[PDB]
Design an enzyme around this catalytic site. Structure first.
Site, PDB file in Angstrom:
ATOM      1  N   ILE A  26     -15.960  -6.943 -27.394  1.00 12.25           N
ATOM      2  CA  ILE A  26     -16.753  -5.755 -27.694  1.00 12.25           C
ATOM      3  C   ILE A  26     -16.163  -4.152 -28.308  1.00 12.25           C
ATOM      4  CG2 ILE A  26     -17.880  -5.829 -24.783  1.00 12.25           C
ATOM      5  CD1 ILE A  26     -14.679  -5.085 -23.478  1.00 12.25           C
ATOM      6  N   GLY A  29      -9.747  -4.345 -33.215  1.00 11.83           N
ATOM      7  CA  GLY A  29      -9.329  -3.034 -33.630  1.00 11.83           C
ATOM      8  C   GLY A  29      -8.338  -3.907 -34.734  1.00 11.83           C
ATOM      9  N   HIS A  30      -7.646  -2.402 -35.324  1.00  9.32           N
ATOM     10  CA  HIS A  30      -6.106  -3.392 -35.831  1.00  9.32           C
ATOM     11  C   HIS A  30      -5.247  -4.467 -35.872  1.00  9.32           C
ATOM     12  CE1 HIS A  30      -2.961  -2.971 -38.759  1.00  9.32           C
ATOM     13  NE2 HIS A  30      -4.826  -3.598 -40.179  1.00  9.32           N
ATOM     14  N   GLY A  32      -6.293  -6.494 -32.453  1.00 11.71           N
ATOM     15  CA  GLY A  32      -6.126  -7.409 -32.425  1.00 11.71           C
ATOM     16  C   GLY A  32      -8.306  -7.043 -31.518  1.00 11.71           C
ATOM     17  N   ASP A 146      -6.488  12.513 -31.271  1.00 12.82           N
ATOM     18  CA  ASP A 146      -8.229  12.409 -31.994  1.00 12.82           C
ATOM     19  C   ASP A 146      -9.048  11.928 -30.809  1.00 12.82           C
ATOM     20  OD1 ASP A 146      -8.602   8.694 -33.470  1.00 12.82           O
ATOM     21  OD2 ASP A 146      -9.814  10.603 -33.592  1.00 12.82           O
ATOM     22  N   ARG A 150     -17.094   9.495 -30.462  1.00 19.68           N
ATOM     23  CA  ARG A 150     -16.568   8.429 -30.924  1.00 19.68           C
ATOM     24  C   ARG A 150     -15.658   7.548 -29.681  1.00 19.68           C
ATOM     25  NH1 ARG A 150     -14.905  10.397 -35.623  1.00 19.68           N
ATOM     26  NH2 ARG A 150     -12.373  10.756 -35.008  1.00 19.68           N
ATOM     27  N   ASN A 151     -14.932   8.637 -29.179  1.00 13.43           N
ATOM     28  CA  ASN A 151     -13.622   7.941 -28.094  1.00 13.43           C
ATOM     29  C   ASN A 151     -13.608   8.297 -27.081  1.00 13.43           C
ATOM     30  OD1 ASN A 151     -12.247   6.723 -30.206  1.00 13.43           O
ATOM     31  ND2 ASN A 151     -11.295   8.544 -31.400  1.00 13.43           N
ATOM     32  N   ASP A 164      -9.584   6.326 -25.859  1.00 13.28           N
ATOM     33  CA  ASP A 164      -8.510   5.818 -27.183  1.00 13.28           C
ATOM     34  C   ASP A 164      -7.191   6.894 -27.793  1.00 13.28           C
ATOM     35  OD1 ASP A 164      -8.553   4.828 -29.772  1.00 13.28           O
ATOM     36  OD2 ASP A 164      -8.954   6.891 -30.485  1.00 13.28           O
TER      37      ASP A 164
HETATM   38  C1  LIG Z   1     -19.918  -2.318 -22.754  1.00 16.51           C
HETATM   39  C2  LIG Z   1     -19.049  -1.542 -23.903  1.00 16.51           C
HETATM   40  N1  LIG Z   1     -17.796  -1.616 -23.666  1.00 16.51           N
HETATM   41  C3  LIG Z   1     -17.753  -0.846 -24.766  1.00 16.51           C
HETATM   42  C4  LIG Z   1     -15.942   0.170 -24.433  1.00 16.51           C
HETATM   43  C5  LIG Z   1     -14.461  -0.509 -24.080  1.00 16.51           C
HETATM   44  C6  LIG Z   1     -14.962  -0.380 -22.217  1.00 16.51           C
HETATM   45  O1  LIG Z   1     -15.516  -1.419 -22.307  1.00 16.51           O
HETATM   46  N2  LIG Z   1     -14.025  -0.319 -21.735  1.00 16.51           N
HETATM   47  C7  LIG Z   1     -12.925   0.128 -22.579  1.00 16.51           C
HETATM   48  C8  LIG Z   1     -11.208   1.283 -22.409  1.00 16.51           C
HETATM   49  C9  LIG Z   1     -10.936   2.080 -23.805  1.00 16.51           C
HETATM   50  C10 LIG Z   1     -11.696   2.588 -24.378  1.00 16.51           C
HETATM   51  S1  LIG Z   1     -10.791   2.734 -26.188  1.00 16.51           S
HETATM   52  O2  LIG Z   1     -12.206   4.271 -25.915  1.00 16.51           O
HETATM   53  O3  LIG Z   1      -9.851   3.704 -25.383  1.00 16.51           O
HETATM   54  C11 LIG Z   1     -10.966   2.313 -27.035  1.00 16.51           C
HETATM   55  C12 LIG Z   1     -12.389   1.357 -28.410  1.00 16.51           C
HETATM   56  C13 LIG Z   1     -12.350  -0.184 -27.901  1.00 16.51           C
HETATM   57 CL1  LIG Z   1     -11.210  -0.535 -27.015  1.00 16.51          CL
HETATM   58  C14 LIG Z   1     -13.540  -0.589 -27.973  1.00 16.51           C
HETATM   59  C15 LIG Z   1     -14.410   0.084 -28.972  1.00 16.51           C
HETATM   60  C16 LIG Z   1     -13.939   1.591 -29.299  1.00 16.51           C
HETATM   61  C17 LIG Z   1     -13.025   2.539 -29.223  1.00 16.51           C
HETATM   62 CL2  LIG Z   1     -12.684   3.953 -28.779  1.00 16.51          CL
HETATM   63  C18 LIG Z   1     -13.274   1.732 -24.647  1.00 16.51           C
HETATM   64  C19 LIG Z   1     -13.855   1.120 -23.484  1.00 16.51           C
HETATM   65  C20 LIG Z   1     -18.368  -0.223 -25.587  1.00 16.51           C
HETATM   66  C21 LIG Z   1     -18.277   0.003 -27.036  1.00 16.51           C
HETATM   67  C22 LIG Z   1     -19.529  -1.174 -25.006  1.00 16.51           C
HETATM   68  C23 LIG Z   1     -21.302  -1.395 -25.952  1.00 16.51           C
HETATM   69  O4  LIG Z   1     -20.356  -2.075 -26.981  1.00 16.51           O
HETATM   70  N3  LIG Z   1     -22.313  -0.782 -25.499  1.00 16.51           N
HETATM   71  C24 LIG Z   1     -23.051   0.285 -24.104  1.00 16.51           C
HETATM   72  C25 LIG Z   1     -23.169   0.545 -24.591  1.00 16.51           C
HETATM   73  C26 LIG Z   1     -24.275  -0.814 -25.069  1.00 16.51           C
HETATM   74  C27 LIG Z   1     -23.331  -0.872 -26.113  1.00 16.51           C
HETATM   75  C28 LIG Z   1     -24.022  -1.045 -27.467  1.00 16.51           C
HETATM   76  N4  LIG Z   1     -22.991  -1.786 -28.495  1.00 16.51           N
HETATM   77  C29 LIG Z   1     -23.172  -1.535 -30.020  1.00 16.51           C
HETATM   78  C30 LIG Z   1     -23.009  -2.916 -30.440  1.00 16.51           C
HETATM   79  C31 LIG Z   1     -22.813  -4.032 -29.455  1.00 16.51           C
HETATM   80  C32 LIG Z   1     -23.627  -3.271 -27.851  1.00 16.51           C
END
Ligand SMILES: Cc1[nH]c(/C=C2\C(=O)Nc3ccc(S(=O)(=O)Cc4c(Cl)cccc4Cl)cc32)c(C)c1C(=O)N1CCC[C@H]1CN1CCCC1
Length: 286
Positions: A26, A29-30, A32, A146, A150-151, A164
């Site tokens: 999903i 990041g740097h 992993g 930050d 996006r976060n 984030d």
């Molecule tokens: C299913 C999903 N989950 C996430 C993000 C997080 C999650 O499920 N739990 C998290 C806990 C912490 C964080 S964070 O903001 O602290 C760090 C992070 C992470 Cl782990 C991953 C991506 C960006 C960031 Cl900033 C993000 C998520 C995302 C971005 C998605 C996700 O990826 N979704 C959801 C809407 C449709 C779809 C859009 N994607 C576009 C390319 C493939 C599909």
């Protein structure tokens, strides 16, 4: 380090509790990848989760620093702030950081999505949620550094979570990060307060500036800020008093709030308490 292993013990998760789907990435990041997972809580139920791997980190010292800085998040608890589910320890392979699943992903992509077409009112509501999440963090004296669309993530109930930070902080998409700053590191310079670019320091007040950019992001439905200003020029741009312009669909009083967020004098910018009030007031008019 002992003290650290003590605290992590508080939030430890046994491997048999945790299933990771390494075929289900999903985010990268740097430190992993982040994977789909399912966690079993002690009193029964399957909890869908996001599992952050730290396998990329080579130095044990880098890992100590990371846990050290991030662990305090376990103390936070608020419906608009991302929570830590726990940390899974293992034989070969680094600790896994276990985080809640966010079904609807990041706020920026959510609102850019054309079939979603959130209304001005929906947009302001999201902004109010983020405000409340920042109000909580500031009261714990935690500085984010930050904040940006996006976060922030959205869960299955469309509750917005400021994220984030702490054990969830990493470089996930570098498009809007730039080394053209005094530290020489990749920073989000187009979200940073003027004084942080000059002094290299971050406070809650510069968090307020960032929240102001975040608002502009909402009302433009995810347009990139200062698209015509080079990263070389953002300091000069701001010194001259120039600011992001009012979005077509931004209500006038909300643009006022934005402008208050970018006051050159740090102490002249509202608190998040102020913001929660003002923005709540504006939301009700809808
Ligand atoms: C299913 C999903 N989950 C996430 C993000 C997080 C999650 O499920 N739990 C998290 C806990 C912490 C964080 S964070 O903001 O602290 C760090 C992070 C992470 Cl782990 C991953 C991506 C960006 C960031 Cl900033 C993000 C998520 C995302 C971005 C998605 C996700 O990826 N979704 C959801 C809407 C449709 C779809 C859009 N994607 C576009 C390319 C493939 C599909």
């Amino acid at each position: 380090n002992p003290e650290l292993v003590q605290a992590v013990q508080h939030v430890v998760i046994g491997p048999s509790s945790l299933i990771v789907h390494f075929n289900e990435v999903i985010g990268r990041g740097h430190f992993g990848c982040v994977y789909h997972g399912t966690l079993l809580d002690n009193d029964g139920k399957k909890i869908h989760c996001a599992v952050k791997s730290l396998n990329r980190i080579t130095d044990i010292g880098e890992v100590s620093q990371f846990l050290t800085e991030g662990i305090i998040m376990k103390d936070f608890s608020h419906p608009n702030v991302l929570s830590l589910l726990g940390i899974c320890l293992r034989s070969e392979g680094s600790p896994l950081v276990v985080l809640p699943y966010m079904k609807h992903g990041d706020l920026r992509n959510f609102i850019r999505n054309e079939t979603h077409n959130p209304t001005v009112k929906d947009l302001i509501g999201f902004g109010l949620q983020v405000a409340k999440g920042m109000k909580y963090l500031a009261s714990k004296k935690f500085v984010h550094r930050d904040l940006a669309a996006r976060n922030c993530m959205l869960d299955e109930k469309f509750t917005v979570k400021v994220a984030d930070f702490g054990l969830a902080r990493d470089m996930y998409d570098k498009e809007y990060y730039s080394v053209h700053n005094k530290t020489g590191a990749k920073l989000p310079v187009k979200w940073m307060a003027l004084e942080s670019l000059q002094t290299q320091k971050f406070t809650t007040k510069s968090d307020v500036w960032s929240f102001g950019v975040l608002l502009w992001e909402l009302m433009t439905r995810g347009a990139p800020p200062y698209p015509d200003v080079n990263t070389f020029d953002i300091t000069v741009y701001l010194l001259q008093g120039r600011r992001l312009l009012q979005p077509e669909y931004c209500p006038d009083p909300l643009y006022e709030v934005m402008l208050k967020c970018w006051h050159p004098k740090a102490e002249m910018r509202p608190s998040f308490s102020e913001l929660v009030s003002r923005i709540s007031a504006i939301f009700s008019t809808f």
